[PDB]
């Protein structure tokens, strides 16, 4: 609950930032910062589901940047498809998902094709 409540607080900050942001570069920097805060906070609450924490960090960045996403469940795996990203947003999202996965001890696979980044979170 504490981790889910933290996501909600960071989501409101993410939506207020993009409202007053000066560009996609500033929004991206703030989005990576928010995702790291959530990841480190969730790591301090080991009782919370590690797989779900990674997904919440991804969704926090998706909402902060205002990009389109899709989620599909395959048993224990979760696939996230994020479209419309520029080159800088792809590199930062790849970087942030890798770091967040390592913090949570979760195995994730990342594929980049065109504007589309596909993330698979397992177990």
* Segments making up each domain of the chain, as ranges: 2-121
89: phi > 0 → left, psi -120 to 50 → alpha, else beta; which? alpha
| CB-based contact 37:61 (threshold 8 Å) | no
- Rounded CA gap, 35 and 60, in Å? 6
Q: At what angle do helices 2-20 and 50-65 cross, to 10 degrees?
A: 10
Q: For residue 39, what are its two tokens?
A: 């990841």
Resolution in A: 2.1
Would strands 68-74 and 116-121 be described as parallel, antiparallel, or unpaired?
Answer: unpaired
Instruction: Collapse the DSSP code of 20 into the 3-class scheme (helix H, G, I; strand E, B; otherwise coil) and give the result.
Output: helix
Q: Enumerate the H helices of 44-86 as residue ranges.
A: 50-65
């Amino acid at each position: 609950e504490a981790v889910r409540r933290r996501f909600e607080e960071l989501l409101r900050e993410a939506l207020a930032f993009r409202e007053r942001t000066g560009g996609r570069r500033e929004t991206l920097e703030h989005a990576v910062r928010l995702a790291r805060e959530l990841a480190e906070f969730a790591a301090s609450h080991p009782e919370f589901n590690r797989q779900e924490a990674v997904l919440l960090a991804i969704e926090l960045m998706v909402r902060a940047m205002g990009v389109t996403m899709e989620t599909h469940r395959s048993g224990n795996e979760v696939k996230v498809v994020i479209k419309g990203l520029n080159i800088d947003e792809q590199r930062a999202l790849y970087r942030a998902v890798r770091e967040t996965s390592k913090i949570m001890g979760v195995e994730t696979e990342i594929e980049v094709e065109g504007d589309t980044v596909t993330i698979v979170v397992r177990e």
